[PDB]
Amino acid sequence: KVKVGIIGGTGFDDPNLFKKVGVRQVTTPFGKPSDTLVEGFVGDVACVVLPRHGKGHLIPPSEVNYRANVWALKDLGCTHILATTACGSLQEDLVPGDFVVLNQFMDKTWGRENTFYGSKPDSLKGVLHMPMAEPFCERTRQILIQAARNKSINVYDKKTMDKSACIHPCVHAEGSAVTINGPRFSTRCESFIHKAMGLDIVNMTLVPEVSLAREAGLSYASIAIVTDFDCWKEEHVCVDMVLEQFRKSVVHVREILLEAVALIGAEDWTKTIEANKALVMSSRQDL
Template structure:
């Protein structure tokens, strides 16, 4: 009973989804965290009356490759400005026939093949949290937020998959064919370069985190396939934003 909890949505935009003109009454906020600077300024504003904060994961000039993104600063900065939820987008390659280019996938699990990335806030950084955090990762993503995304995709009639395991590779190179075939054998549905440590840090920070992926290609396991298209990555912005349409936010709130 009483007042509804205050919701503030952080949106982490992947390739093609870092357009700050999405917001009304937008302002730029330059922030610093105990873990350094985030990838870019935070764009604060509203979408249909819901307070939101947009952060370009790779920077607005796409200047940071996946292994160089300061994921800790990104997540901490969003929490620092009061975000309660994070909705993330990612362009992905498909590892299974049924997940076709153009499909949306609401991620529910991951396999981590990255290395050298800072995956915890609990490392005695000055100004950071104290102690040690042994974090359970089942479920990896917030189920309530995932269900909101699924509801929105259904309402819009988009081709989508309600679950998907992302194999997260180091990048910036793509997989070899042998690696792609191995990822298929492991049970991966998709491959990308940024879900880890982003999802881990968001959970450690106590934030609801869900991610919607757009399938852009069939990776390289399939014979006679064309490489990922920048046009499909740009489609991610249009398709995913229409899917959000803040119906997601209304469900969460």
């Protein structure tokens, strides 16, 4: 069957997505995950939730143990990983309150453990060169988009719909993230260059999470939450208004996530999961 793992970012440090059966602590060959995992069910579908930054949001993006988080979900039998990320916008049509079902990224991270395989003792033995041209699971991407439709949330498709038909708050059916290492935000010079490159949003947590999920043979899809990080540019009122907008976004994402879990459990994934595993084996360069 299927089992959906949920990596909750900012605004999901303490998830209460569903009535939890129990809390579980796990260990991995790559260290401890960010926190204990919340185990439960959405209908008849087993579901596990894991806060990326841990309760209290004490772990910065560059220090998150992405390998342990992904492998812990793997060892629990997860077949899919849905993830959230709070991001800043780089393009005019993506405004705070919108969401993005990402399909591309540009990686500007460094100093993070981004692979399970290598020649070091703390990694699995082998050399794995994974294809990443379309780095997400496309079937799971379209389930997030369909879940938004089922919850009456606007979906904007810039290939298909006019910019005048962009109704906020909307889910953008595609988008690219530039993942910076953090913890500082970008300079204006850096933001202008990323924008000139055509990137849609900026965040700090997508990579290596999406890469490691594919290495583990897991269907991974991310829903990004557009928020606002320039209240420095009436600060108490600005932060209060953005926090309220973000709270509304978290409500909608929780609705989308809960609907997406059910939509995953309603389909058969035998051939896709088999293809996920075979892609791992065929990417081994030592074999």
